[PDB]
Symmetry: C2
Subunit: 470 residues, 2 copies
């Protein structure tokens, strides 16, 4: 699924083994110096080896504090050590870098003159948020008006909105499935989905990432073998897939997945976290870009953090599914309602996207998010880099493959006034370290042109042009 140059797959294992060897050696001279209030230690000796022997070496590439709105250009605060690199502290000095590590695709995480004036007015009339849950006193009028805009937008009959995009997967999967069920998940699913599956009693299998000929062969075996020990019938089967598989940048093969789930009478659980304002000619997600009937999928989970510039989540489906969840979902019963100015800013963003604001800049954003991604991705391939994903996706990871290139590609770019994101080993597979580039609809062409020459010059030093240029 990823083409790896053979000579680089060898100098990566060597680079990791050298780190392992020096780390064990150094940790062996700490265990004999600890000779100099009775409870067990907070953490054992060797459960955080790669946290203190690999992460602390490059800890200045993460948790960079900014002091400006998440815009195309922000200010980055500078940090010193003051005690030989153990606890970084922040100065007063700042910079002015190009934002390429945020998520605001449509450029809503800013001050725009249709949403912020309405949200400020919906603040001084409702005071932040209610202190009760939604079934007691936290269902304001704004919370009832917003659950209609989401149903109109997404397309399904009814929807529920929560206040966290991570609790939208750990507090719902236990409700729909329980013990005796099955969950054929995709390999590269978020942590929230797997934690939600663990919170119930269901069994989890995994089919190969983004290929249906392997999804069929797993369903056949699992229905022909029943429960793992007492070969009862499987009470249910649910298949979980994602719209755009981030950190791989690929659009899912939805038409070929739904067709196989219908045949074996399994259910489908879609996850449009990255693809609900980005892809599509109207912004309706993958079910519109790929031309699939929205009633073939049973549940559709989403998130407003990335595109609409406001926290939250939702679930949409048949009108009895929503009635069941509103009566038996712990996140709906026990948790405080989503704040009011954080719901007005979703209402007034869906109005802009649908063009009901009077102006017509709801289509300029949708066109400029595409004419920027198709340009950046095309230009990176011509210089010989290795970028993944298709042509219609806001994310494009660049593969690095070497643990030592992670602090080299980031420190140079920050020094030349460009900010990016890099991902290491403990989170990713060992061999696949990458950098993630996020392109928004607020970047101008003059910025992408200037940022491509900064990247092309840094990529010569590290030698990450694995493919041949022209």
């Amino acid at each position: 699924m990823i083409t790896i140059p053979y000579l680089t797959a060898v100098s990566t294992y060597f680079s990791y083994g050298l780190l392992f060897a020096f780390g064990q050696l150094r940790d062996f001279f700490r265990r004999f110096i600890d000779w100099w209030q009775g409870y067990a230690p907070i953490c054992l000796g060797h459960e955080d080896f790669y946290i203190r022997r690999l992460y602390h070496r490059i800890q200045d590439c993460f948790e960079r504090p900014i002091s400006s709105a998440p815009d195309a250009w922000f200010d980055v605060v500078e940090r010193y050590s003051n005690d030989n690199n153990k606890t970084l502290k922040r100065t007063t000095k700042t910079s002015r870098c190009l934002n390429l590590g945020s998520y605001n695709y449509l450029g809503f995480g800013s001050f725009d003159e249709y949403c912020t004036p309405r949200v400020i007015e919906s603040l001084k009339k409702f005071s932040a948020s209610t202190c009760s849950s939604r079934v007691d006193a936290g269902t304001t009028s704004v919370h009832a008006e917003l659950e209609e805009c989401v149903t109109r937008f997404v397309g399904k009959p009814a929807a529920v909105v929560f206040g966290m995009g991570y609790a939208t997967n750990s507090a719902i999967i236990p409700v729909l499935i329980g013990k005796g069920g099955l969950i054929i998940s995709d390999s590269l699913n978020h942590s929230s989905i797997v934690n939600g599956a663990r919170g119930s009693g269901a069994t989890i299998r995994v089919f190969q990432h983004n290929t249906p000929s392997h999804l069929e062969r797993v369903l056949r075996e699992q229905i022909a073998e029943g429960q793992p020990r007492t070969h009862r019938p499987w009470k249910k089967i649910i298949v979980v897939v994602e719209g755009i598989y981030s950190m791989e940048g690929e659009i899912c093969h939805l038409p070929e997945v739904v067709a196989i789930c219908k045949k074996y009478k399994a259910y489908v659980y879609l996850d449009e976290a990255h693809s609900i304002g980005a892809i599509g000619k109207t912004g309706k997600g993958i079910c519109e870009l790929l031309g699939v009937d929205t009633a073939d999928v049973d549940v559709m989970m989403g998130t407003f953090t990335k595109s609409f510039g406001s926290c939250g989540g939702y679930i949409a489906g048949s009108k009895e599914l929503i009635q069941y969840l509103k009566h038996q979902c712990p996140a709906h019963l026990y948790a405080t309602s989503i704040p009011t100015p954080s719901a007005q800013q979703i209402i007034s963003a869906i109005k802009v996207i649908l063009g009901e604001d009077g102006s017509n800049r709801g289509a300029q954003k949708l066109a400029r998010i595409r004419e920027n991604s198709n340009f950046f991705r095309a230009e990176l391939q011509k210089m010989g880099f290795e970028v993944l994903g298709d042509n219609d996706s806001p994310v494009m990871p660049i593969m690095l493959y070497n643990p030592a290139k992670i602090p080299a590609f980031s420190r140079e770019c920050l020094r030349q006034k460009v900010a990016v994101v890099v991902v290491g080993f403990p989170a990713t597979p060992l061999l696949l370290a990458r950098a993630r580039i996020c392109i928004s609809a607020s970047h101008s062409r003059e910025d992408l042109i200037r940022a491509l020459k900064v990247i092309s010059k840094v990529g010569d030093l590290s030698g990450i042009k694995y493919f041949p240029a022209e």
Copy 2:
């Protein structure tokens, strides 16, 4: 289940091996002399080895033709060879032996003055039997009156009567169970029951003869493992047992079997072939002797050949079972009805047994069948023989254990005017050859006394007094 003297288990295998060795040698000198119309042979070379090398040596102990009614005393025809023992032919000379190899328990296979005059009258008014089946023109009035006497006698709501006791098991088991079902049979079941189970598509397991602690352990495994390859659920389970296990003479442990079949929701199929006029204070069978509610068993098969002195069979059960069988049983639809004088002789025998004939000799038979069996069996044990069965059973096999004692115990007894039955290897297990003694209610005490001294003198020569006398 049978105590075998060790020194006799060794001279039996030696006796059989010597027969095997001489047989192979002799058959090897026939295959080279056959040198002196194109179709394949009727029978291969070596599928009837024990028919021509073991049975032909003692073929004069079987198929003895008699020329008198099956009474306490009959006439046995004498046979010569005339061509060096290849084809026995019958003479005109006869004998007068003591009948100990028939089956008429209650002494109905004779000329008694309440049944024969009625049967002769029901003959000259109905001419043998109808030439049609029962669903077209073979349901005479006598056939409708007889199916009421059987329901009154047996006790269950409805009953069907057939014309053969062997077709009463091969044409019904296919109807009740089919493919996907299970049949836990007892080891020592008749050939008809196993053939009937083979005629359907059901699977057959076997539990250990007359022990319930092994019946439970088979049901547990078979319900915990499902179908043998595709672990579906078992569609049904039926348990087949017999009232009195002939050729072992034991009464079944019915109360401990029904209790375990209720627990696992299996069905029960009883087989009262040997125990429907013999045991019981009224002659109602094992369900009366052992005190078990007759509604705990689902199907009850029987036979009129042994006790009532007339061919036939029956099945009794719930009024919808009979309605289903009368509409979907091949033996009821395609086969000629049971003859009329052979049904009148069952009606007029059940009337005698129930005491509705005016006289009271329906209880004299039931008492004299018991005071004769309890005497004969008690006297045989005191002389040191090995007899099986309980105290309430008309059959008592005497074990011989040696293939050469089969023609020795029979030829002597016939010479001293006593007729018995012996059973060999191809039919029985190898080690267990026996003689079967049948005691009726028509034998007098003077006959049993005289027959016991003939047996006690023959048993000295062959040395079949394995147990110690007093």
